[PDB]
Design an enzyme around this catalytic site. Structure first.
Site, PDB file in Angstrom:
ATOM      1  N   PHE A   1       0.867  -1.171   0.000  1.00 11.63           N
ATOM      2  CA  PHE A   1       0.000   0.000   0.000  1.00 11.63           C
ATOM      3  C   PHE A   1       0.907   1.224   0.000  1.00 11.63           C
ATOM      4  CE2 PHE A   1      -3.152   2.994   1.780  1.00 11.63           C
ATOM      5  CZ  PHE A   1      -4.238   2.690   0.986  1.00 11.63           C
TER       6      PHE A   1
ATOM      7  N   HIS B   1       0.602   7.584   2.122  1.00  9.64           N
ATOM      8  CA  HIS B   1      -0.643   8.297   2.347  1.00  9.64           C
ATOM      9  C   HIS B   1      -0.599   8.952   3.718  1.00  9.64           C
ATOM     10  CE1 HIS B   1      -1.159   4.495   4.409  1.00  9.64           C
ATOM     11  NE2 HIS B   1      -2.101   5.067   5.142  1.00  9.64           N
TER      12      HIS B   1
ATOM     13  N   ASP C   1      -3.466   9.636   6.817  1.00  8.85           N
ATOM     14  CA  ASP C   1      -4.698   8.990   7.242  1.00  8.85           C
ATOM     15  C   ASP C   1      -5.878   9.950   7.216  1.00  8.85           C
ATOM     16  OD1 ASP C   1      -3.447   6.628   7.660  1.00  8.85           O
ATOM     17  OD2 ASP C   1      -3.707   6.591   9.854  1.00  8.85           O
TER      18      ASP C   1
ATOM     19  N   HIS D   1       2.982   7.523   5.672  1.00  7.68           N
ATOM     20  CA  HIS D   1       3.461   6.173   5.923  1.00  7.68           C
ATOM     21  C   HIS D   1       2.991   5.268   4.794  1.00  7.68           C
ATOM     22  CE1 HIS D   1      -0.410   6.736   7.882  1.00  7.68           C
ATOM     23  NE2 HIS D   1      -0.631   5.439   7.754  1.00  7.68           N
TER      24      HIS D   1
HETATM   25  C1  LIG Z   1      -2.041   1.058   7.291  1.00  8.48           C
HETATM   26  C2  LIG Z   1      -3.210   0.276   7.889  1.00  8.48           C
HETATM   27  C3  LIG Z   1      -4.067   1.163   8.780  1.00  8.48           C
HETATM   28  C4  LIG Z   1      -4.054  -0.403   6.791  1.00  8.48           C
HETATM   29  N1  LIG Z   1      -4.486   0.558   5.786  1.00  8.48           N
HETATM   30  C5  LIG Z   1      -5.692   1.138   5.838  1.00  8.48           C
HETATM   31  O1  LIG Z   1      -6.570   0.793   6.622  1.00  8.48           O
HETATM   32  C6  LIG Z   1      -5.942   2.292   4.870  1.00  8.48           C
HETATM   33  C7  LIG Z   1      -4.826   3.307   5.051  1.00  8.48           C
HETATM   34  S1  LIG Z   1      -4.878   4.128   6.663  1.00  8.48           S
HETATM   35  N2  LIG Z   1      -7.228   2.908   5.148  1.00  8.48           N
HETATM   36  C8  LIG Z   1      -8.242   2.895   4.280  1.00  8.48           C
HETATM   37  O2  LIG Z   1      -8.197   2.288   3.213  1.00  8.48           O
HETATM   38  C9  LIG Z   1      -9.460   3.673   4.702  1.00  8.48           C
HETATM   39  C10 LIG Z   1     -10.603   2.772   5.134  1.00  8.48           C
HETATM   40  C11 LIG Z   1     -11.792   3.560   5.657  1.00  8.48           C
HETATM   41  C12 LIG Z   1     -13.033   2.667   5.887  1.00  8.48           C
HETATM   42  N3  LIG Z   1     -13.391   1.873   4.697  1.00  8.48           N
HETATM   43  C13 LIG Z   1     -14.209   3.530   6.306  1.00  8.48           C
HETATM   44  O3  LIG Z   1     -15.198   3.635   5.618  1.00  8.48           O
HETATM   45  O4  LIG Z   1     -14.034   4.145   7.443  1.00  8.48           O
HETATM   46  C14 LIG Z   1      -3.280  -1.551   6.160  1.00  8.48           C
HETATM   47  O5  LIG Z   1      -2.711  -2.384   6.841  1.00  8.48           O
HETATM   48  O6  LIG Z   1      -3.266  -1.539   4.850  1.00  8.48           O
HETATM   49 FE   LIG Z   2      -2.689   4.794   7.225  1.00  8.59          FE
END
Ligand SMILES: CC(C)[C@@H](NC(=O)[C@H](CS)NC(=O)CCC[C@H](N)C(=O)O)C(=O)O
Ligand SMILES: [Fe+2]
EC number: 1.21.3.1
Length: 329
Positions: free
Chosen positions: A209, A212, A214, A268
């Site tokens: 990933f 980005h 958060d 991150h």
């Molecule tokens: C980095 C981690 C937090 C995780 N990534 C993630 O969760 C990534 C980046 S923070 N976050 C997202 O895609 C947002 C999800 C929001 C969720 N669908 C909602 O409607 O609230 C991973 O392990 O990929």
């Molecule tokens: Fe994140």
């Protein structure tokens, strides 16, 4: 060639108590971590993470394709036009490794006023059949409130760190309307691992990933003990060591906005590692109409002149932008 980030372990237990000086000492440590790499581990948090990991594993490993279609979000199932956030995010064999299940405030029911008004970003959770996954819904809803409680204590620490009364953030973080979400992410071991699921960074690092910031006020993350996260500094990316007994905490871009970037949202990314692991974030979001007037802690009078931003508008735009930049998860 790759250095390791300084990620302190902070005992947050005083934030649940009434010893005001001990709370200030925790706040100082939060302040210091937030102004350095932006990450810290919360320890002595009181959450049973052994049971969290076990119950999540049982769900991920026992759910079948039939059930995934029935729970799928709109991106994978055109029939589910009302499921943008809540539901199952399918993997694609040979192409996409990650899969996850997202759920929102359990108080969002068909009778809830925000649901009756059809307000964006509010949805009613979907759950698997109780008879196929006994106790899962009970556990997941209880976990939501356990991590809500931890997060409410953390927000008191952040408030005190910035020189505000301890309810400055927490007063907007309410069980009846929080837009916070839990995501239960499975990163699988695969052999062969699909090359389409691996991204190459500019510096040559293989990633699951990309970089980005958060979309959150703060992010409260539990991960199994497999190192994967990196944080950007001026001198390059640094590895965050794993700890499967603590919660990893960082600010999101709403905190950066309201503090005039005094507490930055750290950039991150997730390195590719071929290992079965779990990533279980709780995104601390406020209410749809919650607004906090921005301030600048660097200034004696705290004036900022940044525009106040409704949390609902921030969240709707932020979730879409993250999908557009880093892909549908
Ligand atoms: C980095 C981690 C937090 C995780 N990534 C993630 O969760 C990534 C980046 S923070 N976050 C997202 O895609 C947002 C999800 C929001 C969720 N669908 C909602 O409607 O609230 C991973 O392990 O990929
Ligand atoms: Fe994140």
């Amino acid at each position: 060639s790759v250095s390791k980030a300084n990620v302190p372990k902070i005992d947050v237990s005083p934030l649940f108590g009434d010893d005001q000086a001990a709370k200030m000492r925790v706040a100082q440590q939060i302040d210091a971590a937030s102004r350095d790499t932006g990450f810290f581990y919360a320890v002595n948090h009181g959450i049973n993470v052994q049971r969290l990991s076990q119950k999540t594993k049982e769900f991920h490993m026992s759910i079948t394709p039939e059930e995934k279609w029935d729970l799928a979000i709109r991106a994978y199932n055109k029939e589910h036009q009302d499921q943008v956030r809540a539901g199952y995010y399918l993997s694609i064999p040979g192409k996409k490794a990650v899969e996850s299940f997202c759920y929102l405030n359990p108080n969002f029911t068909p009778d809830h006023p925000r649901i009756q008004a059809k307000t964006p970003t509010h949805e009613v959770n979907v759950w698997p059949d109780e008879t196929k996954h006994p106790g899962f819904q009970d556990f997941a809803e209880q976990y939501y409130w356990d991590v809500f409680g931890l997060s409410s204590a953390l927000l008191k620490g952040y408030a005190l760190a910035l020189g505000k009364e301890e309810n400055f953030f927490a007063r907007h973080f309410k069980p009846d309307d929080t837009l916070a979400s839990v995501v239960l992410i499975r990163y699988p071991y695969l052999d062969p691992y699909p090359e389409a699921a691996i991204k190459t960074a500019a510096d040559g690092t293989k990633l699951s990933f990309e970089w980005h910031e958060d979309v959150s006020l703060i992010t409260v993350l539990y991960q199994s003990n497999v190192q994967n996260l990196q944080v950007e500094t001026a001198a390059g990316y640094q590895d965050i060591e794993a700890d499967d007994t603590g919660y990893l905490i960082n600010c999101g871009s709403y905190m950066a906005h309201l503090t005039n970037n005094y507490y930055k949202a750290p950039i991150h990314r997730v390195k590719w590692v071929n290992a079965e692991r779990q990533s279980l974030p709780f995104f601390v979001n406020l209410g749809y109409d919650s607004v906090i007037d921005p301030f600048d802690p660097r200034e004696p009078n705290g004036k900022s002149d940044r525009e106040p931003l409704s949390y609902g508008d921030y969240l709707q735009n932020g979730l879409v932008s993250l999908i557009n930049k880093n892909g549908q998860t």
